Design a protein around this ligand. Sequence first.
Ligand SMILES: N[C@](CC1c2ccccc2Oc2ccccc21)(C(=O)O)[C@H]1C[C@@H]1C(=O)O
Ligand SMILES: N[C@](CC1c2ccccc2Oc2ccccc21)(C(=O)O)[C@H]1C[C@@H]1C(=O)O
Ligand SMILES: *[C@@H]1O[C@H](CO)[C@@H](O)[C@H](O)[C@H]1NC(C)=O
Ligand SMILES: *[C@@H]1O[C@H](CO)[C@@H](O)[C@H](O)[C@H]1NC(C)=O
Lengths: 761, 751
Amino acid sequence: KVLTLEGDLVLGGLFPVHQKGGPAEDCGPVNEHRGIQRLEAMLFALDRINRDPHLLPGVRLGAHILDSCSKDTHALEQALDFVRASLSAPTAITGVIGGSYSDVSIQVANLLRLFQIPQISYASTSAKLSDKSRYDYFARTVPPDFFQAKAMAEILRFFNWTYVSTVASEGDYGETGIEAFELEARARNICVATSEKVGRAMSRAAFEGVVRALLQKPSARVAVLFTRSEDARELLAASQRLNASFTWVASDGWGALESVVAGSEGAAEGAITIELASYPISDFASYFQSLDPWNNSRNPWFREFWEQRFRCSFRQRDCAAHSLRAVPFEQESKIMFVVNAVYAMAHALHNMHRALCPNTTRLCDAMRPVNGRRLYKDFVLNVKFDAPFRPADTHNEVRFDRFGDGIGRYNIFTYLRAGSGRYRYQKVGYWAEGLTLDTSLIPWASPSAGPLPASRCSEPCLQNEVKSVQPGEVCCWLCIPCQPYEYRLDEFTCADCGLGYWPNASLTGCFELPQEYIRWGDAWAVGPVTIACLGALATLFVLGVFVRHNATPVVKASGRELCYILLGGVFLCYCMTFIFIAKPSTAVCTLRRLGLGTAFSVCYSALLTKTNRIARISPASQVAICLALISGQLLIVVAWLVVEAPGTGKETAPERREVVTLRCNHRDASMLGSLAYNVLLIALCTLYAFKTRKCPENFNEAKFIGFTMYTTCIIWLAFLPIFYVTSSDYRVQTTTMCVSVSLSGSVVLGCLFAPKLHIIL
Amino acid sequence: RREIKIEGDLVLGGLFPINEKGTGTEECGRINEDRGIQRLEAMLFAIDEINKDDYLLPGVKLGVHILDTCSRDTYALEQSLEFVRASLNIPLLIAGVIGGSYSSVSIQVANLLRLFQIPQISYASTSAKLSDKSRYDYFARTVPPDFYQAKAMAEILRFFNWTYVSTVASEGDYGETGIEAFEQEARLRNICIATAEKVGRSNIRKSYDSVIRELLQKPNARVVVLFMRSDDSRELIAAASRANASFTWVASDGWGAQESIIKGSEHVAYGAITLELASQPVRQFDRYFQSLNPYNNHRNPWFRDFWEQKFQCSLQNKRNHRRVCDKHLAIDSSNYEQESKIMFVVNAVYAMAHALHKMQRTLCPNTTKLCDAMKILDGKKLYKDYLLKINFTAPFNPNKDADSIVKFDTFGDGMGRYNVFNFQNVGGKYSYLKVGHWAETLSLDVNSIHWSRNSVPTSQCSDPCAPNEMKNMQPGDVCCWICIPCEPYEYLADEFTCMDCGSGQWPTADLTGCYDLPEDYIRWEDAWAIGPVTIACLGFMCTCMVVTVFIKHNNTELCYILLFGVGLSYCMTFFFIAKPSPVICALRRLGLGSSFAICYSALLTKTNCSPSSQVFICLGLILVQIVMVSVWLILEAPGTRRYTLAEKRETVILKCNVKDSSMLISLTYDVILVILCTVYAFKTRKCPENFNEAKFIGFTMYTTCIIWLAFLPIFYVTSSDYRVQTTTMCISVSLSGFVVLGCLFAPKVHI
Ligand SMILES: N[C@](CC1c2ccccc2Oc2ccccc21)(C(=O)O)[C@H]1C[C@@H]1C(=O)O
Ligand SMILES: N[C@](CC1c2ccccc2Oc2ccccc21)(C(=O)O)[C@H]1C[C@@H]1C(=O)O
Ligand SMILES: *[C@@H]1O[C@H](CO)[C@@H](O)[C@H](O)[C@H]1NC(C)=O
Ligand SMILES: *[C@@H]1O[C@H](CO)[C@@H](O)[C@H](O)[C@H]1NC(C)=O
């Protein structure tokens, strides 16, 4: 059976009018939905094109439609006619509008690529047919099967669903879509946890095992499905038996079919299924509900179709009043694709005729030998016509791409639960180029009640609990609470810049701990002040007594200048000790410690000049020598300040903040020379006193000199190990130094008290 | 059209380029004598021998259906339809197609045949795309593909140690595919590719001259890898001859052993290693082909046209332009040479015959004629089972070398057997010579190879250098590396760089030759130290004389203690030695410090004028301080100075590195204290002795203070070496001893 028409340009066709059948029959039963309705749609489109004055006004299109019988070998055998009609009365096939199954389309494209014959399919959705290296004359008006993977990936990204539990199928549908989805999920930072492969020959116990394997990962509510129509009902039944919710994001295999969810209502509620968008053709329904086996002689298979759908016989009068109008008729979901393919071929032919036959509207001599290469490359893949028979409000565009595939256009569905009615589907969005859903219509995966989460990687860490560790994970990262000794400088790890100082709110400024250099409160701050005040009062009383005793024969025998120098040094050291408990700075702490050292040196010089006269027994020579020594010591201290006095102190590593010091931090090295000079002077003075004190003059003041020599030296010898040991701890060092300075002054004050008592009495 | 149809139980297809490719109105014109007619006659001869054979398909008679391709892809594609229309002019069922002489023709024929499950065996198609079974799952060939010669050439380069090569190719499927195979196979053998370029079909001399100039830019690539076609090879050789150069060409089957490549340029191509496919001559075919005339060869329709085109005569309707063909004209050895693929055609035919025989014996045993279920042949079963697995000896082997076995691999390709030629000169006659063979492994005859000039080419970049002098570092690739010297105080690694094994060691001839230097300070027994040594000896002699004269007098011990310090001071110079010791240095330092302390403190008793016991107790305190350091961990074994920045070949560990730094400071502090005490006491004392005694004591104190003050900066600025450290100490200790001894003895010796 061959359906042939007459026209200037003849268009081929391949429709599955008959099923596979098997080895019993040649082809078998007649397909009433995928072989008859699509063939009549092609015929109707060809008639409309022939009656269209704006589409090929002069050229009349023909038809050479054949039956593939749902077989690839039969398709090759039938396409051999298309080959040996243009190769070598055979018609002239300028292009075939055929191919409803992937294998038939692949075989036909493989055969027709060699002979340069364009082919536009209407129902073949596969990823292999997009390989232009093997099929470079194949086009289609339907999107391939890997666009829905992108659609569901975008859907998952919109709902922030990262942890998926996708289930694929076995065969050709799914065994490429799952890899396409996995490739398109990495770009959206979506990681797949568990992946099964449902097979066509598969036991129900295996389905139960698959569903149980879905329960192995607990926090995976979503599950992307690439199963076929018959491979999803079993999964739904198993899920219902195991009482799992398992919100589904399925491909076109589920769609809005009522034969896959019936009998398993309750477990599939809330699923997100996607179906290819298709609008009904108003004129096609009227055309199809007007045909009878008497006035329709063009179609050779209409006889068998009428005999099959209407159970009757034609050898004997059994059915004569049957009509298609009374019968309820539903259009095939891929009729608009068939008419779009036919119209695309017609538009390509018209564009070629305009670009090659500009003299007359009739087929000129130039276009008589139609070539497939130029028509496919420059005309077929460049059509931008509006979709015929489209809805008035809806704007539909028919165009191909670099790979010749159709334009992606999918409808997002949701399996709702009507309050008064039964279960039904409802469209909640679309996907033409970008994702678009009506979020305020999903009842079960609703935002008002909280959309279902699937991440399996929680984020309970905000600023201090962040660690971001992952034993072989890239999609998410678990954060482990780290010790507060670290800082959150980087959002990927606990930057332990310093264990002591606590970071700020931003946890970025890894520097010294912000605090105030304060250590004197009310515990012992008053006590040192009280001791200093008592020492100052004692010094003032001694000065007053000496002033009262200034004009006296007793004071004339002894050197008043030495006593005045000693009193001044004691006052200076007392003032330095009193002010040492103060906020350190550049000109405060170091100046005070230098003044204390100078006061100690002056006291040592005063003792030396008090004892040298006693040992001898020009007086101004000793005073000048002592003044020169004090000036030299002060100059040495000042030179130490200018050259080699860098001071900074802060404890950072062990549980500590910044030390309370500004410039008097490395003063131990600076004071080392002053300490050595003071020790040498004290040793010389003690030796001189030991050699001296033989002469009992000035009311035995040599006894007082020896008392000072035996007291100050002993105090220094006791304090030196204490000062060395206390130097390790900053807090201990300051108090010990102040106490030692106060005691050094107090020993001299106690020794000088006796002459004051004698003067008073 | 014309065809050769022979009735038989099994019919084999055929595709030969009988007519050469034409242009214009005529699709195909003149007859191909060598590739179309001769190969067709070889196939017919093989079929006749198979039919006459009794051990190969005895009851089955092999038919044939041969069609012409006209050396055109589209013509062959349209003519292949009669091979598939029989499975749907009475059609004949085609078991297999023995055809395909061009890569494009074979590609399209296989593309058409794979849909109808018809096996195809080629005899001259060597394209690499035909090895892709995903696109060609019913294609086989008895010839190896074109990327086996690339592997053979890479193996030749690896054997000859030619790492730096210069590969030049042609434009098209052949050159591009082969150069891609070469540059994906050479990286596995550590062979680098330099100035990789290709020539086009412009047929202009300027491009070839530019290619030659670009090749001449690099002088470390003496060998040139050519995988270009015959005309491109000839043009490149001519361009190399112009503006004469010198290169070692490693060519492929495009050059081979053809003399068309060399004509007038037999000098630049000298010593060129070329590859040619091995093809044994079929002797039985000579008698068959030479005894053919248009009178008995009625099977071949193209034989008459081939005869009239080869002999330039006419048989029927002869005009005055062409002479009438003469009688007794026959093909003989005078004007006939075998095509190089006759054996490949015969092997293809016999492979198909063996597959059919195996199927016949397997499907139905105990019978010879065709059986049931063999009327229709399954292409998949015939190809994947009975065709890809055959192990039979090549028919018509002149000597049965046992290395000519026809078998197909997993991809259906044949076995690669190439002959390695070498264009040389013998006795003033330029000719080729087979100097090797490549079946599965390279086997060359190096003795008979005549390279360019008179020595084997090197063609290697970055020639090796001494690892101890220069470090081997690859800047961008392993191909070339620069010899850059490394530091001379560090050893060498395997191939990376030079690293040091710490301070105090110097490398040697060994790879890891850094060892600790056994160097110490410089001996001064017979060296620069003479004057200080003589001064120390004189001081020791004077001290000994003073001790002797003092010991002789019996109250005419305090001076002996001071003299003992001088004696203990003298041994400090002798203590300084290059012999390493962790205790001797500390002992010498402590002894010197104690000697200085006691010598300075001996004057305290004189200045202050029971006191002897206190002086001894005071001296013990200084000694107790010296031994206190030994209690702590301050003392340590001597260590070499860390003079890494200084360019010192060797280091000396003699100062103990922990002894001097603190001992000098402690001794200086003690000396300063005692000197200040003595200076204070000297002026206070109102001469409690003889007039000269007080003056002598004052002069001694002043001299000791001056000597210590002068020696203090020397200690800090010593910059301790083998000389200055010992010399300064010796001078200081000699000055200290002389000051005490002089002021102690001169007033005494005077009176
Ligand atoms: N477009 C389909 C898609 C088809 C398919 C669709 C859903 C489930 C299973 C399934 O089997 C496969 C396998 C591989 C490729 C495509 C499919 C085509 O045949 O190409 C088919 C609807 C078209 C038709 O036959 O009318
Ligand atoms: N075996 C060849 C190899 C051939 C070839 C050999 C050398 C130089 C150029 C060249 O052109 C190409 C290009 C692509 C692939 C193969 C080749 C074939 O035609 O396949 C050719 C000897 C066979 C024949 O034509 O009789
Ligand atoms: C997904 O997360 C983003 C923030 O990353 C948020 O803005 C958006 O509202 C979320 N979508 C939901 C909750 O549906
Ligand atoms: C290539 O180098 C190896 C390495 O030493 C050597 O054994 C071999 O003989 C060389 N081949 C030559 C020089 O042909």
